[PDB]
Write a structure and sequence with these properties.
Length: 129
């Protein structure tokens, strides 16, 4: 897998972000994770977390997996990096997301993410409290 550039258009919530990719606006859905909806417990905290991480980033990158690049709603499916740190992984590590929606095409970072979850759960963080 490889990283490609993109620029923030707008934060949406824990696991969706509007980015410009190859000069086109596109809503991206984070691969292999699930945040609570804003209306749910830790939704606001997940939203604020991703928002801060994407707004403070100098360099946003997107990384497609080996499978489907678009979901049935037209959202881009990627791992999103903020100055070299994966947002997908950072949410899991803080207990603001669960590893989820792990489909066979698009599972290159599964183990990495599950490691981060196992340590969030260990530390009883947020969702795991
Ligand atoms: C993360 C991800 C979600 N989706 C779809 C499955 C879910 O379908 P349904 O809408 O039918 O429940 C939905 C979950 O995203 P949200 O958590 O953003 O709702 O998006 C994919 O198809 N591929 C993916 O990699
Ligand atoms: Ca969600």
């Amino acid at each position: 897998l490889h990283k490609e550039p993109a620029t923030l258009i707008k934060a949406i919530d824990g696991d969706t972000v509007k980015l410009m990719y190859k000069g086109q606006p596109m809503t991206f859905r984070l691969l292999e994770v699930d945040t609570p909806e804003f209306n749910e417990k830790y939704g606001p905290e997940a939203s604020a977390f991703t928002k801060k991480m994407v707004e403070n980033a100098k360099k946003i990158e997107v990384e497609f997996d080996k499978g489907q690049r678009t979901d049935k709603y037209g959202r881009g499916l990627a791992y999103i990096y903020a100055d070299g740190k994966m947002v997908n992984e950072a949410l899991v590590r803080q207990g603001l997301a669960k590893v989820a929606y792990v489909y066979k095409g698009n599972n290159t970072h599964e183990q990495l993410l599950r490691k981060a979850e196992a340590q969030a759960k260990k530390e009883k963080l947020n969702i795991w409290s």
